[PDB]
């Protein structure tokens, strides 16, 4: 370390065993230090006990994310543009069938690349690109092909900011160590400056550049690579030139206007994505507020302010070390980052953003689950690192007797609670349907909880639903339709190839799901809740800070004393949330196409992927694989010799993978040790094995891989399930 | 110009009104809460003169005051002051 | 702040380069020279128009027979006796080291001074065009790039094109 | 060695001292106003295929076309690093001639401004009754800067 530290040598620490922690990896030879070195590889105990550098890593260690973001979109925008279908499919859309990727006829492959669209071979897409593209206030393939090396210059150079840190002499404290400003800029202009400039490039251009595509032409018989600049005359169809108005203001008459936005709503008839008229309108709305938003401030004074009675003393103080702590502020963060993503995964489905997605089913539920598995792989996250706050970050214990100290004061409490609030729900949110199965298995439906049986009567209706779609007559404005086609109220006529949004009914069958979410939301969040707040002192042990939030188990003792800990309430808290989303894709799904998507023709006879199947049959949890799992999923097991054949083909594998899961999660660990020297020995005799002594899995490392395949396993194995049954027949 | 130049005054007109409404609400500050109507320091009626927005909104309901008639239905009677 | 960066065959390199490089001559000055118009032209019948075929590959079978051996004498004794183990003097051997080749053998040696000396002069001459040589044919094997790129008509491969004034190729010159 | 790059508070002032002055004698068209009757403008893509700004301009042009345009700016930017290298010192760039004593004549020095040294000592009658010298030159060039779209077009000039 020791080597030279000094002063006295440029010369680089290329060849000298070891590093990190300091009877070191040792000069005597060993295997699990091959694990250690990429685990925990980044994490702050070691490197330097003095913060500093961290925050001088953290922020160039980041970059190289965006630069990669960067490497990455630029394959996809190079990819989906000279290896085409964009420009064949979008004077054909409604028609085409997307593609981007294509294998190369090497061995086998050649199946995998079957017939997508304007005339060619390929591997479809369900990532919603050529969408996002309708955008291009232009057109043309070599184009894109700008927007993409584009691309590669942010990145090298917005990867040359990395060098331009960490490995230049950095920064300092201060920097950071002041916070003062750092919203103040972030918001106001970007946030705000993106959205605004958004704005400035999605009227001028795109609105009008798929105001007169939604009806015909060829591109280039539209939209040139300049024409829109001064000539604010082909602005004219898409409103005035301002005609008397200047900046604003009211001393301005409409006998007949009111600029572009002119609010929307619901639908195009001929490109249900919404209305554009309305999408300036909204990021424009927006950045204001951020513009205007991001000038505050400078930070306690607001926090060090408002107390109470049994409220927050520590409050005021919430946290000198939230200037201070990192660990602390991404996993606050990451709750609402993540949080903030699963939002998404509705506000999508229920009111598409981009033009033809609905239609497209596939290439926007894909979506809708995608996100929705960040939007949980980010939260459970967003605990793991507050426990790794609540176990250490600080130096000392300078952050006293506050709203925290305070929460911890309760604790056998908070989570006393929580608790009988779970097993209340599973009694009510999950043997629910277990009557069901055994009273229509013992079969006497009089006496069920079918959306018709238990008294509901054939009615849902009166609640919030149908006082949204129906709102345009309050202090609402109006503007045909709703906010979201799929309220209660009014409306049908949605698209001309196949459907989009409709109503969407509920009752029971929607009643109890949205039930058994509630009872998976919150044991998930037990387990992380008391996880994180137990973290460093308990009366199991309390001598339990004393590593780190790791630590296997403390000891055969105590009764059990195992898993406690809290990287493993971040072990089995993923466990759950695996279930939590992966039970929340099997909710829309199912609905989405037993009733929604489906399908028009004469007299608009709508004929769902499934005329509602649902209706008393997923109240039976048999139904879920009656009607789910057996019923679809016929198209993943029929997959085979095809052109997608890789799902099914996947399917088998993953759906393997899971099913290996099992054997890191489900044993021992000197046994793997007991069995390694018998190979040893054998090893020995050829004379062939103990340079650097083999060792079997870090007991936790063990459970690393656990989890970790039970997940890309357990789910890669639906993303096969999935696309297979949204490509061909809905 | 145009009716636009009256537009500019006009926009002066916002602009103003707002800036000059705003030194006074800022100015003796870290206050928050609290007035006259509340606890104790008190001179009561309603009262009289404190300015910035009244006199500012007087204003802006004013100003419709001389362009008045001028711009409605144009022009009627025969001088509706007497005077020659 | 500098690269660490390297070496040491950083001594290797440069001998291979001797290498590229005064065989870029053989090249370099038998084209141009050519000969453009001799009097002219280039006709070679005699072994070659009618015998069915000449070379090819059998070609290159003769062709680096001889190259094959004398490539491989070249740098396989350059120099290097002592030729075996087995601890460091770094080239990665000199593991010929301390002994050049032999304690009183032969005549492993060339020249008197108890060395190799081919005397103290001669950085001259080859320091200069030489190590040039390496530089020189950096660019007219840039022009190897230059001189035929743009497949003369006969051919445009994957049709971008991608736009369209005039030809190009090789002779001397520029329309500029 | 490895070149070099001294960053300190404010080297980025130095150059971007200098960056502007270049650029406010590279402002060109009214420090040299005989440069452009009508010549600020490129005259972009105007082919004989098609058109330029658009209504333009248009009673951008005749022309000093080309190509070997990249070739300068590189080829004379491989002058402007070596004004930085050369007179790094250690002189001896009079390489003169290996013979001929007849070689006293000099031209100059170290020039700037009147030469060699300033001159022709011998002067003041009548001409007659650090940073300013650059100020005023970017109020010479960002003010061409929206002259380039200096322009309301649908309306004009509200002020007349
Ligand atoms: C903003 C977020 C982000 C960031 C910057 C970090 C940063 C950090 N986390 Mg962390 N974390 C996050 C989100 C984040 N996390 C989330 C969402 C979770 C919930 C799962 C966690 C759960 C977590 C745990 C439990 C731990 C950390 C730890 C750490 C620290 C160790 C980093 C390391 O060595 O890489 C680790 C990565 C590897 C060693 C690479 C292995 C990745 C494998 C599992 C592949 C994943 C499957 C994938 C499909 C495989 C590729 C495809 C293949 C089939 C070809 C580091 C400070 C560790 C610590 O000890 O704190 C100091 C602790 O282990 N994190
Ligand atoms: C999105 C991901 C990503 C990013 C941006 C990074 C970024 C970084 N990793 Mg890292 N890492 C990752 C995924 C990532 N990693 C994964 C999946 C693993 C497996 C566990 C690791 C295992 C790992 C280790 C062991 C180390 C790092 C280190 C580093 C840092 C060193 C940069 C450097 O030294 O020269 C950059 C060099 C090049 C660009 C040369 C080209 C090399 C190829 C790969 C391209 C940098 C912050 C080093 C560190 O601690 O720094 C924080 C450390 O040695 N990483
Ligand atoms: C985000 C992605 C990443 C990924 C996963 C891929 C993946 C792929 N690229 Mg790709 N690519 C990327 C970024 C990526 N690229 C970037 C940033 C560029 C810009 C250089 C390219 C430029 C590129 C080209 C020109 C090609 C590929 C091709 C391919 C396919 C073969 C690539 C390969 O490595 O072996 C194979 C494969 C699907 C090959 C393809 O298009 O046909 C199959 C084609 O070779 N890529
Ligand atoms: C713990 C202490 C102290 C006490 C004793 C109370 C007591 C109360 N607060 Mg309260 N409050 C406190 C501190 C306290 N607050 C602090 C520090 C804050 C700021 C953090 C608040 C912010 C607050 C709000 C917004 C409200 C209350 C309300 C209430 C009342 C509930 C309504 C009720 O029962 O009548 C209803 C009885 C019927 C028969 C009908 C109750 C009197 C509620 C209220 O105003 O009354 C409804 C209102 O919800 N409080
Ligand atoms: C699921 C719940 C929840 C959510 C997310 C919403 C969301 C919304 N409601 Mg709403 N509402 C709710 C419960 C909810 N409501 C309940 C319980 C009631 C009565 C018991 C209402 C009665 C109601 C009315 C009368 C109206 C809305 C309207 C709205 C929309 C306008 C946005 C807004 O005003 O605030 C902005 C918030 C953010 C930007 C964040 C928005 C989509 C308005 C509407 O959409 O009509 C066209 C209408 O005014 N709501
Ligand atoms: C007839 C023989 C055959 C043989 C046995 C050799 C042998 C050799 N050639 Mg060689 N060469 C040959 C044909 C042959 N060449 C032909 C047909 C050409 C085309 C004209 C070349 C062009 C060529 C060049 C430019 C060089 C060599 C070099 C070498 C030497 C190192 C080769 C190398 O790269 O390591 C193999 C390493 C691997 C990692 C594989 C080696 C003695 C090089 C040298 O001088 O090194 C001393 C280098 O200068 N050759
Ligand atoms: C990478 C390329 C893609 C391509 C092929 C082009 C091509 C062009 N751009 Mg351009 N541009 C692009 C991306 C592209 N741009 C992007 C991503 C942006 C940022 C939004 C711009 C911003 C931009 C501007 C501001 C301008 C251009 C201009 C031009 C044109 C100069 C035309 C000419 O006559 O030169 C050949 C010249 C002859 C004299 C013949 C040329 C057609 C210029 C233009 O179109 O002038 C009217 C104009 O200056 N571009
Ligand atoms: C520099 C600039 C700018 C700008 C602008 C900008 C600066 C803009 C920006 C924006 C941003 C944005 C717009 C953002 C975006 C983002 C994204 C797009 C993302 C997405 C996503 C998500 C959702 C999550 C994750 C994933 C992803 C990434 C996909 C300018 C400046 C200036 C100056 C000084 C001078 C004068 C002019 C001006 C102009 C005034
Ligand atoms: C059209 C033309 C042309 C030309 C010429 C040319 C013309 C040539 C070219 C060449 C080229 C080169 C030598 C290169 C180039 C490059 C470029 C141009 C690029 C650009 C860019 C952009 C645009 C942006 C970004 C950056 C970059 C750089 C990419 C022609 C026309 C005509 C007519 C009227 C008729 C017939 C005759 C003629 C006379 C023929
Ligand atoms: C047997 C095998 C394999 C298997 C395999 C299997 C049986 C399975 C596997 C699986 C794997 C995986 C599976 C990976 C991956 C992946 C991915 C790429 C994913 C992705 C994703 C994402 C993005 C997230 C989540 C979802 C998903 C998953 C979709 C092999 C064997 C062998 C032999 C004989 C010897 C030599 C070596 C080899 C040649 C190797
Ligand atoms: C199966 C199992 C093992 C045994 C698993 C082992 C030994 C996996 C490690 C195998 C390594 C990855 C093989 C590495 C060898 C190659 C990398 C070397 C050759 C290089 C390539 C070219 C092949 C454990 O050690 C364990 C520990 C704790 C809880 C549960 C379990 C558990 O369930
Ligand atoms: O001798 C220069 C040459 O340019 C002159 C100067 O002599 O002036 C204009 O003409 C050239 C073209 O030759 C332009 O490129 C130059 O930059 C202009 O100032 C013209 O008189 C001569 O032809």
């Known amino acids: 370390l020791v080597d030279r530290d000094p002063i006295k040598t440029s010369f680089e620490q290329w060849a000298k065993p070891g590093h990190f922690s300091r009877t070191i990896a040792k000069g005597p030879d060993t295997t699990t230090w091959i694990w250690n070195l990429h685990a925990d590889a980044h994490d702050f105990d070691s490197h330097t006990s003095d913060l500093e550098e961290i925050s001088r890593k953290v922020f160039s260690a980041h970059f190289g994310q965006l630069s990669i973001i960067f490497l990455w979109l630029s394959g996809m925008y190079f990819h989906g543009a000279r290896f085409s279908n964009y420009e064949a499919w979008l004077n054909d859309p409604t028609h085409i069938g997307p593609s981007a990727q294509v294998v190369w006829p090497i061995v086998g492959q050649e199946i995998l690349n079957g017939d997508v669209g304007g005339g060619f071979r390929g591997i479809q897409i369900t990532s919603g690109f050529f969408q996002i593209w309708r955008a291009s206030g232009i057109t043309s393939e070599l184009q894109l092909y700008c927007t993409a090396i584009g691309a590669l210059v942010f990145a090298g150079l917005m990867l040359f900011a990395g060098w331009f840190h960490y490995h230049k002499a950095a920064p300092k404290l201060a920097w950071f160590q002041d916070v003062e400003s750092m919203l103040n800029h972030h918001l106001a202009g970007l946030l705000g400056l993106g959205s605004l400039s958004w704005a400035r490039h999605q009227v001028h251009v795109s609105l009008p550049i798929n105001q007169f595509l939604n009806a015909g032409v060829d591109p280039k018989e539209i939209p040139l690579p300049h024409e829109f600049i001064l000539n604010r005359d082909l602005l004219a169809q898409l409103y005035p030139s301002f005609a008397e108005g200047a900046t604003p203001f009211f001393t301005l008459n409409w006998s007949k206007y009111a600029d572009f936005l002119t609010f929307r709503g619901g639908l195009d008839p001929l490109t249900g994505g919404l209305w554009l008229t309305d999408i300036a309108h909204h990021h424009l709305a927006i950045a204001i507020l951020f513009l205007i938003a991001g000038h505050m401030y400078r930070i306690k004074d607001i926090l060090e302010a408002h107390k109470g009675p049994f409220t927050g003393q520590g409050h005021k103080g919430l946290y000198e070390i939230l200037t201070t702590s990192w660990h602390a502020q991404l996993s606050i963060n990451l709750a609402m980052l993540g949080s903030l993503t699963i939002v998404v995964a509705q506000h999508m489905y229920s009111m598409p953003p981009y033009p033809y997605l609905a239609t497209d089913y596939a290439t926007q539920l894909s979506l809708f689950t995608h996100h929705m598995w960040i939007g949980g792989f980010l939260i459970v996250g967003a605990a793991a690192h507050a426990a790794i706050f609540m176990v250490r970050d600080y130096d000392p214990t300078t952050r006293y007797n506050d709203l925290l100290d305070r929460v911890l004061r309760h604790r056998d409490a908070i989570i006393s609670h929580l608790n009988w609030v779970c097993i209340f729900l599973g009694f009510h949110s999950f043997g629910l349907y277990i009557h069901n199965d055994t009273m229509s298995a013992l079969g006497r439906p009089q006496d069920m909880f079918s959306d018709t049986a238990i008294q509901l009567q054939p009615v849902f209706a009166q609640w919030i639903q149908n006082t949204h779609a129906l709102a345009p007559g309050t202090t609402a404005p109006g503007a045909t339709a709703s906010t979201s086609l799929t309220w209660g109220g009014g409306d049908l006529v949605a698209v001309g190839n196949k459907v989009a949004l409709l109503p969407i009914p509920l009752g029971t069958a929607d009643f109890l799901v949205h039930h058994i979410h509630a009872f998976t939301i919150h044991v998930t969040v037990l387990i992380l809740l008391k996880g994180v707040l137990f973290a460093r002192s308990s009366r199991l042990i309390p001598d339990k800070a004393n590593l780190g939030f790791r630590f296997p188990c403390d000891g055969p003792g105590r009764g059990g004393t195992c898993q406690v800990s809290a990287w493993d309430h971040v072990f089995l808290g993923l466990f759950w949330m695996y279930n939590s989303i992966s039970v929340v894709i099997f909710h829309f799904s199912w609905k989405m196409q037993s009733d929604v998507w489906g399908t028009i023709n004469d007299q608009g006879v709508v004929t769902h992927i499934t005329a509602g199947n649902f209706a008393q049959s997923s109240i039976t949890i048999n139904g879920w694989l009656r009607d789910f799992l057996w019923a679809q999923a016929s198209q993943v097991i029929q997959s085979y010799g095809s052109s997608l054949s890789a799902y099914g083909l996947f399917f088998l594998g993953a759906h393997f993978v899971w099913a290996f899961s099992l054997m890191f999660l489900f044993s021992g660990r000197g046994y793997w040790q007991e069995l390694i020297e018998s190979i040893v020995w054998a090893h020995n005799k050829l004379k062939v094995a103990p340079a650097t002594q083999p060792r079997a899995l870090s007991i936790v490392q063990g459970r690393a891989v656990g989890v970790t395949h039970y997940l890309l396993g357990g789910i890669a194995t639906t993303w096969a399930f999935f696309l297979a049954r949204i490509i061909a027949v809905g | 110009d145009y009716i636009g130049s009256s537009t500019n005054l006009i926009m002066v007109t916002t602009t103003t009104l707002m800036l000059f409404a705003g030194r006074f609400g800022l100015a003796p500050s870290a206050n928050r809460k609290a007035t006259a109507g509340l606890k104790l320091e008190a001179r009561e009626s309603g009262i009289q003169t404190g300015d910035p927005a009244g006199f500012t909104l007087a204003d802006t309901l004013a100003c419709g005051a001389v362009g008045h008639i001028m711009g409605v239905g144009i022009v009627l009677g025969l001088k509706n002051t007497g005077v020659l | 702040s500098d690269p660490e960066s390297l070496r040491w065959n950083v001594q290797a390199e440069l001998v291979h380069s001797r290498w590229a490089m005064l065989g870029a001559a053989g090249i370099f000055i038998p084209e141009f020279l050519t000969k453009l118009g001799i009097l002219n032209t280039p006709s070679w019948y005699t072994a070659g128009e009618q015998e069915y075929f000449t070379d090819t590959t059998t070609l290159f079978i003769v062709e680096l027979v001889f190259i094959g051996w004398a490539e491989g004498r070249r740098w396989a004794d350059i120099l290097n006796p002592g030729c075996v183990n087995t601890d460091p003097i770094f080239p990665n051997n000199k593991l010929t080291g301390t002994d050049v080749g032999y304690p009183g053998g032969l005549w492993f040696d060339p020249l008197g001074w108890g060395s190799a000396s081919p005397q103290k002069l001669k950085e001259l001459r080859t320091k200069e065009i030489k190590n040039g040589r390496l530089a020189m044919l950096a660019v007219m094997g840039a022009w190897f790039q230059h001189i035929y790129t743009g497949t003369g008509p006969i051919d445009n491969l994957f049709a971008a094109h991608l736009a369209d004034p005039h030809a190009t190729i090789f002779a001397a010159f520029t329309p500029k | ?160």
């Open chain 4, 1 to 160: 060695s490895d070149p070099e790059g001294t960053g300190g508070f404010i080297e980025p002032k130095w150059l971007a001292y200098g960056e502007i002055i270049n650029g406010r004698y590279a402002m060109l068209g009214a420090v040299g106003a005989i440069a452009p009757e009508i010549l600020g403008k490129a005259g972009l893509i105007p082919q004989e295929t098609a058109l330029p700004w658009f209504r333009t301009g248009f009673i951008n042009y005749w022309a000093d076309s080309y190509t070997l345009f990249v070739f300068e700016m590189a080829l004379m930017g491989f002058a402007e690093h070596r004004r930085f290298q050369d007179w790094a010192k250690p002189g001896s760039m009079g390489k003169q001639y290996f013979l001929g004593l007849e070689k006293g004549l000099g031209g100059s020095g170290e020039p700037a401004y009147p030469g060699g040294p300033f001159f022709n000592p011998l002067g003041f009658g009548k001409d007659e009754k650090l940073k300013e010298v650059k100020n005023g030159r970017l109020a010479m060039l960002a003010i061409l800067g929206y002259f380039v779209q200096a322009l309301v077009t649908g309306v004009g000039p509200y002020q007349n």
